[PDB]
Amino acid sequence: AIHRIRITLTSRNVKSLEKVCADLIRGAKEKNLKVKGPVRMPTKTLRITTRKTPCGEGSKTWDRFQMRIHKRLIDLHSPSEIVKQITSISIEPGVEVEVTIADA
Amino acid sequence: YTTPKKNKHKRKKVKLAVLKYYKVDENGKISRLRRECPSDECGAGVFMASHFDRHYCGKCCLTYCFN
Amino acid sequence: GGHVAQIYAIRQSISKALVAYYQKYVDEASKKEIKDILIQYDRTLLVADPRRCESKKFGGPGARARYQKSYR
Amino acid sequence: DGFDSRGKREFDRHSGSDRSGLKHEDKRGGSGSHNWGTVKDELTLDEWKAIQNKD
Amino acid sequence: GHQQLYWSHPRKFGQGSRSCRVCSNRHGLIRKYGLNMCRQCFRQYAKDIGFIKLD
Amino acid sequence: MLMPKKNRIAIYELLFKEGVMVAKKDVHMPKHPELADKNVPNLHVMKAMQSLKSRGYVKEQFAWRHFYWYLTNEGIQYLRDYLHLPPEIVPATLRRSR
Amino acid sequence: MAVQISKKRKFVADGIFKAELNEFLTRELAEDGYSGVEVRVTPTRTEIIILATRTQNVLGEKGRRIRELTAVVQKRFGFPEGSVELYAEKVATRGLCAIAQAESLRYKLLGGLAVRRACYGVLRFIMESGAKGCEVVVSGKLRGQRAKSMKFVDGLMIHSGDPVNYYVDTA
RNA sequence: AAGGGCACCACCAGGAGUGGAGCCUGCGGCUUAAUUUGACCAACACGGGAAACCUCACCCGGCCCGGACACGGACAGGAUUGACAGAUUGAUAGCUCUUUCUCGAUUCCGUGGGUGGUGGUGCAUGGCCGUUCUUAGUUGGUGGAGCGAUUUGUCUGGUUAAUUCCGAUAACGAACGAGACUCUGGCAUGCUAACUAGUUACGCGACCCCCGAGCGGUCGGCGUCCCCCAACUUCUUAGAGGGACAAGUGGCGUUCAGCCACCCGAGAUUGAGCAAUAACAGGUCUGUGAUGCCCUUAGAUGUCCGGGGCUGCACGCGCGCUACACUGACUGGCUCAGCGUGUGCCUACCCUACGCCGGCAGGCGCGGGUAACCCGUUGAACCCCAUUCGUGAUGGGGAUCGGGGAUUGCAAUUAUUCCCCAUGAACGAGGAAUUCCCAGUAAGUGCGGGUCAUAAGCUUGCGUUGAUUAAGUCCCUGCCCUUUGUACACACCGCC
Ligand SMILES: [Mg+2]
Ligand SMILES: [Mg+2]
Ligand SMILES: [Mg+2]
Incomplete structure (x- = not known):
């Protein structure tokens, strides 16, 4: 054996992250691995507000830069071993994974 | 400008002649008229300098003074 | 929220809970004749207030106020 | 005398340069190389160490 | 001078211990999220990092 | 520049192992991240590489805060006759597996 | 864990690495028709x-430059040996890459071609390769103290709104 | 010059104010060895500029070459490199002097030639940014007027936030900008789900109960993915979708564009981001291994180190903070947030729970957190409820100053910051003038981010409480358009 695995996915764009979640669970459903629905962690918004001008002169304008980090969690809980079963990741650029055993 | 001090004079090395600070006798008998700095890194190759009151190796092989 | 906001969230949720309870379990003929009393008194009892806030802008203390300027 | 006490020009449209003014005057009507055009232009050591120190 | 005063003044903190990872400047430095980049150093490379302007 | 010979040969043989050399623009860094155990600081590295650039044995590129010197063919044979190698040994960037 | 870094700092580090790698390759392969990095x-x-736009110059003789x-x-970013690999790929529709077209324009101007002659040549190339519109602006001083700006436009050009992000390529 | 139109950086009607007072800060001036410097609506809490050192560019001093490379010298009989001691120096800089060693081709000297510079020029430039201007303006094709440059299109008029549309019509069909678009807020008891979010139900508990309440009440008590040992997504999170279009009704209108009122509805005008043709000799060479030219380059305008300065005070001005009080202050109790940060390439600096000591600022152990897992149910302030004060420069105010104690830092004096005890100054609502503003807005009120070893009276956001007046006008101030005049066209900073 009994094993349980968790795959976390981090990305900056929603469309890619949703695609890699979708085909990961789709492959596992066909593979009769029990899958817990992809839970969406709250999005991290890294906000940096600088000043537009490179000098001191101007009318005091500020530029708000924004960065969004989206996080997902997918749990695979099959009665038998899992790591030897599923060995493909099928990732597109901009998506970072981190495999973790459910004990941690 | 108009600096109050005159231009500082940099040290000019003496450009000494050959060392020759060791002598032989009776057709050749080595006698060191200087000291050897006894640090292991220094070795016996280098000779500890002799001053009017202290002995200091050419490397940092310590310094011994006789009072 | 704050004290006032929690108060309005209380009175709104209380008036909503039993009117939805009546709709679920008894006839809505009774629901309609208690709902018309609620809306005729205060519509905020059954309809949330949409206004929340407004973002602050980079030229003044708040959303719309601007910093004092001088000419001389 | 064209500046204030601070040092700013009291006539910013009076060019202080004899070579150039407010307008850009094109040299020779935009001809010559390195110039704005004109209408005419419009139309291994590690193993070596090993064998060295093996003996 | 020699090896005991050329870099003797401590720089484990303060504005002199950090500089622009792009142009070595020591003013208007952004340290948030470990950026270690200028105000102007950053506005040039902001899109390459991924800091998009949404609002 | 007052590089001791053990430092100079260490830099040159590293540059022969790979024709490239990356060094941050920092005179005050006590040790180069590579060849740190040779105890030659980053200052001696940069001044050594600027002399080769002036002589034309190496070509220099500069990113944000890092040099990226690349060994040239004019500097290939100079490094041969300086470190005394026959014309059989080539840098890893010049030849790999062939 | 403790030896790891928070995801907020990790993604910022990835963007920093991409930006520096872009800038270094801009300063290195500019004359080799460098366009971009993925x-x-x-x-x-x-x-x-x-x-x-030209792989045979990005890679040297026998692939020496790769x-x-x-x-x-590897030596700059401290990558493990063999853990990073670089590919050179020729970009299709070279006339639709603003970076490449601006690079070609600098190459002509350094050669001494007239600004009108060079800019009209690149506008014809962009429209020939197929684009709704294009616009080049050359600003600065030539043969004189006073600076000047010349603007060469043709075709459709939008300036405002979100579609500019995915419809306009700028260099 | 005339005529239209628009705008809370214009007014009207008002709200809070500023200017009046003390202080923090930025300019000017004075003084200085230096008090570095840029900038004068669109400069003056701006250069993310809250400077003890660094920063630093300024002043006073003292080291270093980190002057590549080429040529010629001198040189293993020494080109040269460092140095213990004493003086000398601020210095434990062999910086120099007495002193003898050490280093070994790497250097040194000379001639050419580099190189670096927060040195100058933003009126030599790039890029970026600001403003005109977020106003609504701007330009092809074909056709018409014309000999041309050009013009019509792009307009009398109605309408709109908008040359936004409708209508007249030598124009028709378009393009940019506006709009559209992206993000955000507001509704989905509809969908997909969640031990890093929970909620109901149930099982044990802990207490109040007993008048008996008994499927009684409370529990942020423990549990039911401790995977066999409940279900579900309402609350929370985030994806896909829906939803609002002047849609329906009534009235006005060329009965067109559209406008007003009402119903149902979460919403019948949520805020931003982006933003044209061009101009401003607008600001930046002190952001840059952006950069031309000029200056300097070994007694340096390079670079390092030490100290000082950027704070210095007869005065003037700008942004602000705190107040003048009872609509209050003090004391105590009760009691509710949301943005959002968090342990480091160099890089040394994290958020802190819990216990122990002190009154405090603090100190010491034990952990947790690289994070919806820990801080943290962020027990925030205001507010609410009780106490005292009683119109008095008073228990308002907390400037100024003395003494003491901590924290960071190598370094705290010209006080870094904080804490305790002392003094208690003006200020009794502020002239002429002048700023910002239309709904979760102003205003009161705290909290995060940046700056940061120490740091907020600044700024950037967030939440809490939460209004008065108005649905208009060209009167003031400006801006735009049309007509008009022109000897201007570098375009009134003109010409003469
Ligand atoms: Mg728009
Ligand atoms: Mg007191
Ligand atoms: Mg006339």
Whole structure:
């Protein structure tokens, strides 16, 4: 054996992250691995507000830069071993994974 | 400008002649008229300098003074 | 929220809970004749207030106020 | 005398340069190389160490 | 001078211990999220990092 | 520049192992991240590489805060006759597996 | 964990690495028709793709420059040996890359071609390759103190709103 | 010059104010060895500029070459490199002097030639940014007027936030900008789900109960993915979708564009981001291994180190903070947030729970957190409820100053910051003038981010409480358009 695995996915764009979640669970459903629905962690918004001008002169304008980090969690809980079963990741650029055993 | 001090004079090395600070006798008998700095890194190759009151190796092989 | 906001969230949720309870379990003929009393008194009892806030802008203390300027 | 006490020009449209003014005057009507055009232009050591120190 | 005063003044903190990872400047430095980049150093490379302007 | 010979040969043989050399623009860094155990600081590295650039044995590129010197063919044979190698040994960037 | 870094600092670090790698390759392969870089990172190894209009110059004789560039980025970013690989790929529709077209314009201007002659030549090339519109602006001083700006436009050009992000290529 | 139109950086009607007072800060001036410097609506809490050192560019001093490379010298009989001691120096800089060693081709000297510079020029430039201007303006094709440059299109008029549309019509069909678009807020008891979010139900508990309440009440008590040992997504999170279009009704209108009122509805005008043709000799060479030219380059305008300065005070001005009080202050109790940060390439600096000591600022152990897992149910302030004060420069105010104690830092004096005890100054609502503003807005009120070893009276956001007046006008101030005049066209900073 009994094993349980968790795959976390981090990305900056929603469309890619949703695609890699979708085909990961789709492959596992066909593979009769029990899958817990992809839970969406709250999005991290890294906000940096600088000043537009490179000098001191101007009318005091500020530029708000924004960065969004989206996080997902997918749990695979099959009665038998899992790591030897599923060995493909099928990732597109901009998506970072981190495999973790459910004990941690 | 108009600096109050005159231009500082940099040290000019003496450009000494050959060392020759060791002598032989009776057709050749080595006698060191200087000291050897006894640090292991220094070795016996280098000779500890002799001053009017202290002995200091050419490397940092310590310094011994006789009072 | 704050004290006032929690108060309005209380009175709104209380008036909503039993009117939805009546709709679920008894006839809505009774629901309609208690709902018309609620809306005729205060519509905020059954309809949330949409206004929340407004973002602050980079030229003044708040959303719309601007910093004092001088000419001389 | 064209500046204030601070040092700013009291006539910013009076060019202080004899070579150039407010307008850009094109040299020779935009001809010559390195110039704005004109209408005419419009139309291994590690193993070596090993064998060295093996003996 | 020699090896005991050329870099003797401590720089484990303060504005002199950090500089622009792009142009070595020591003013208007952004340290948030470990950026270690200028105000102007950053506005040039902001899109390459991924800091998009949404609002 | 007052590089001791053990430092100079260490830099040159590293540059022969790979024709490239990356060094941050920092005179005050006590040790180069590579060849740190040779105890030659980053200052001696940069001044050594600027002399080769002036002589034309190496070509220099500069990113944000890092040099990226690349060994040239004019500097290939100079490094041969300086470190005394026959014309059989080539840098890893010049030849790999062939 | 403790030896790891928070995801907020990790993603910022990835953007910093991409920006510096872009800038270094801009300063290195500019005359080689450098266009852009797409990096695909998997935990086993990182792949860096150099999109350029001329692969046979980005890679040297017998591929010497590729292994030269891989080695010089291993030493900079501290990559494990063999954990980063660089590919050179020729970009289709070279006339639709603003970076490449602006590079070609600088090459002409350094050669001494007239500004009108060079800019009209590149506008014809962009429209020939197929584009709704294009616009080049050359600003600065030539043969005189006073600076000037020349603007060469043709076709459709939008300036405002979100569609500018995915419809306009700028250099 | 005339005529239209628009705008809370214009007014009207008002709200809070500023200017009046003390202080923090930025300019000017004075003084200085230096008090570095840029900038004068669109400069003056701006250069993310809250400077002890660094920063630093300024002043006073003292080291270093980190002057590549080429040529010629001198040189293993020494080109040269460092140095213990004493003086000398601020210095434990062999910086120099007495002193003898050490280093070994790496250097040194000379001639050419580099190189670096927060040195100058933003009126030599790039890029970026600001403003005109977020106003609504701007330009092709074909056709018409014309010999041309050009013009019509792009307009009398109605309408709109908008040359936004409708209508007249030598124009028809378009393009940019506006709009559209992206993000955000507001509704989904509809969908997909969640031990890093929970909620109901149930099982044990802990207490109040007993008048008996008994499927009684409370529990942020423990549990039911401790995977066999409940279900579900309402609350929370985030994806896909829906939803609002002047849609329906009534009235006005060329009965067109549209406008007003009402119903149902979460919403019948949520805020931003982006933003044209061009101009401003607008600001930046002190952001840059952006950069031309000029200056300097070994007694340096390079670079390092030490100290000082950027704070210095007869005065003037700008942004602000705190107040003048009882609509209050003090004391105590009760009691509710949301943005959002968090342990480091260099890089040394994290958020802190819990216990122990002190009154405090603090100190010491034990952990947790690289994070919806820990801080943290962020027990925030205001507010609410009780006490005292009583119109008095008073228990308002907390400037100024003395003494003491901590914290960071190598370094705290010209006080870094904080804490305790002392003094208690003006200020009794502020002239002429002048700023910002239309709904979760102003205003009161705290909290995060940046700056940061120490740091907020600044700024950037967030939440809490939460209004008065108005649905208009060209009167003031400006801006735009049309007509008009022109000897201007570098375009009134003109010409003469
Ligand atoms: Mg728009
Ligand atoms: Mg007191
Ligand atoms: Mg006339």
